[PDB]
Symmetry: D2
Subunit: 103 residues, 4 copies
């Protein structure tokens, strides 16, 4: 009984958004997106995470992320939709753009 | 040095961080921290990040909004060392500011 | 709206953040925060940074190791607004965790 | 009665170090170095500061820095030397490298 509508698996809109974040992987049923970010060291990873934290609390949409030294393993979904929404893709895009500074 | 499962030093160190739990084989210690919101959780993580890079010993941590699920072990030791317990203690002290 | 010097609303808001001082012309409010070390100071600043970008209202702050010298004013108002006092209050509450 | 030796003004070594951080300005008497960093917004500035904070506490050498939204105005010196030391230039270099990710 999720109160929000999720993007349907394979919907034209979901695919349109996924095109903007091509390094992310759609999970089974298209209920989330995943990306594992890799950096040189923790100092870089933390600089990346710090920007994402500011964005996440601004838009009130937070990553499920696992950091181990120089890697940040991320899964995004909207709990209140039981699946993906526009907000997940917007967060993924911000994260992609923040990570680009390190490549 | 790697701390052997149930070793005197391991058991002694564990008493200093009693809210942590030993995992199978005593290969790591775990604690899940809970805060009021992400803002608090991030303030906590920020202090830990500074400490971690200072001592060059890093947590395996999973953050979801107001929770931080932490597992500590020494990567090149294939188990626990003094550094894990020192990190746990710092984390405990950092979290106490939010109680 | 810009709060006029000595205005009823300004004086009322100032009572909520009594450790801050009004500057000349009541153009800004100031407080210098002191912590035990940089690690604490940074934990404090980190929470404030999240809040600042959330509400889109930012401190003028000077950090030297364990001290954070802060002046708040609303850049496009040429004086103080409600947002400055709201930011001051958040900062006060964040600092209290280190007392 | 500073317990540490400072780099003398115009010393060959001071100049050798300054060459590595050319966007920094030597102040009067060569007692400090200054640089004002500019970013697109606070989110970027914070990502920059976050990396520098980690470095600073690792080496126990901290910037005197003033942040206003997207700008970070920095002055570096070693109090215990009453002037510049190798540590100031090392910090400046780290900061330069962290800022380069945003240009
Ligand atoms: Na979520
Ligand atoms: Na200094």
């Amino acid at each position: 009984m999720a109160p929000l509508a999720r993007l349907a698996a394979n919907s034209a809109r979901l695919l349109q958004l996924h095109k903007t974040v091509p390094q992310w992987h759609l999970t089974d049923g298209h209920l989330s997106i995943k990306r594992k970010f890799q950096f040189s060291d923790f100092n870089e990873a933390w600089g990346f995470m710090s920007r994402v934290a500011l964005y996440a609390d601004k838009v009130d949409h937070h990553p499920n992320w696992y950091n181990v030294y120089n890697t940040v393993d991320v899964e995004l979904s909207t709990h209140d939709a039981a699946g993906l929404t526009e907000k997940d893709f917007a967060l993924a895009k911000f994260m992609d753009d923040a990570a680009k500074n390190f490549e």
